[PDB]
Amino acid sequence: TVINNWLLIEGHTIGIGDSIADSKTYQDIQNTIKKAKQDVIEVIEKAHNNELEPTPGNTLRQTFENQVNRILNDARDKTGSSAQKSLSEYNNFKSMVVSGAKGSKINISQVIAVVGQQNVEGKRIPFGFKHRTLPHFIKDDYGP
């Protein structure tokens, strides 16, 4: 009762301004994504040139998938951390996450920085079409 009346005084809301981040934050997120995509390209080139060597207990396909997933997840986490650094005290997404009332830091990160890897059955989006994911992509494209 008493906290709801004080809330009548102070008030609480969620808006677009909570989702927006600083321009520097967006630039850093973009730079992180560029670096990650370039690193995934490098790993794919290593695999194509047969430089890659299988991790114990894993096939070359499985170790390549694990390395790519690790790079993508690390970039996603870094972008999320940058977005969370951007958050102000007044930010209401942060208010709800800090209070624990609703939401999580994952949700803030997806809202502000990067939605992240879409995975089905514990693997990246499968090659549903013949050796490709969608008809718009070229065959044998393992990029992000």
Binding site: L72, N73, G116, Q117, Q118, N119, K123
Partner: peptide, 8 residues
């Protein structure tokens, strides 16, 4: 929808 370690 997040990653391989998260949720779909």
């Amino acid at each position: 929808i997040w990653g391989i370690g998260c949720n779909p």
